[PDB]
Amino acid sequence: KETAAAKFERQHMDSSTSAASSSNYCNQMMKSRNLTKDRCKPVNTFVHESLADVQAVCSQKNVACKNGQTNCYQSYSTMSITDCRETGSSKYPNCAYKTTQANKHIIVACEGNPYVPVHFDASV
Amino acid sequence: KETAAAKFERQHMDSSTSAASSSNYCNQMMKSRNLTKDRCKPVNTFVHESLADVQAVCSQKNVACKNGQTNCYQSYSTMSITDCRETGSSKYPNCAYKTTQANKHIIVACEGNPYVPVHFDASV
Ligand SMILES: [Cl-]
Ligand SMILES: [Cl-]
C-alpha cells in the first residue's frame, strides 16, 4: 500500500540538477544579454540554431509582418526555440521569467545589405 | 557601433548551446509517474529540489490552502519547478502536455508523523 508521503514524491519530485538549471535559463540569459538592464523586457525568444541558418530565412518565405510591414520572412523548417515570458511576481531588478521550449517556424524582419534579420516577429 | 543586426544576434541568438530542456519533458514524466493511467491529470507540478528541502517547508510559513484548510506552508526560498498543463488537443488515453519551467515559492499541504508534504497546493 503506497503511503501518502511516497505518493507525493512520485507525482511531484524530480531532484535533477539539469532540470533545476534549465528552470533558470531565461532568468540567466535575459540578464547576460543585458535585457534586464533598466527594465524587465516582458517577452523575448532565443533561437538555438546557427547564425547562417537564421540569416538564410531572409531569402525564404516572404510573409506579412504583425505591424503592417512587408519585410518579414518565415523559415521553411522548424527551429529550436526558447520562449522567455515575465512571471507575475517579477520585480526589477530581479526580473523573473518562465522558460518554455518549442520547435517552430520563425518569422523575422530583414533590412539592409546584406539583407539580414533585424527583428524577431513571431513563431508558427 | 552596435548595428541593428548585431542587436538581433545579442537579443535572439544562442547558437553556442542547445535547449537546456525538452518540450516533451511533461509527456514523458506524466506517463512514467503513472499520472495518466486512470485519466489525463489536467495539471501537475514537479519540484527539482532535494527531498529534504521540500519536506522542510512543512515547518515554514504557515499559509491557508486554496480550499480553506490551514495545513499548508509556503517555502521561504524559491524552488526550480516545472508546470505540466494538459494541451487543448489532449484526449485520454493519449494525454498531451505543455511544459513550463520557473523558479517560484511552493505551497504544500502537510500531515502525519513525521509531518511531511502530501499534496502540492500551488506556486507563487
Ligand atoms: Cl520591448
Ligand atoms: Cl496533489
Domain ranges in chain A are 1-124
Asked if B63 and B74 touch (Cβ cutoff 8 Å), the reply is yes
Cell digits for B96?
498531451
State how far residue B45 is from chain A, nearest Cα, in angstroms.
6
Which of these is catalytic: A12, A19, A34, A89?
A12
Residue whose C-alpha is closest to residue A122's, from A85, A76, A74: A74
Please say whether the structural domain B1-124 has been given the CATH code 1.10.3090.10.
no
Burial class from Cβ neighbours inside 10 Å (0-12, 13-18, 19+) for residue A111 reads middle
Question: What does R_g of chain B's alpha carbons equal in angstroms?
Answer: 19
Strand ranges inside chain A, DSSP E: 43-47, 61-63, 72-74, 79-86, 97-104, 106-111, 116-123
Cell digits for B36?
495518466
Residue whose C-alpha is closest to residue B37's, from B89, B85, B81, B92: B92
Q: Is-catalytic flag, A48?
A: no
Resolution (A): 2.1
Q: A34 to chain B: which residues are within 8 Å by CB?
A: 10
A119 contacts B104? CB cut-off 8 A: no
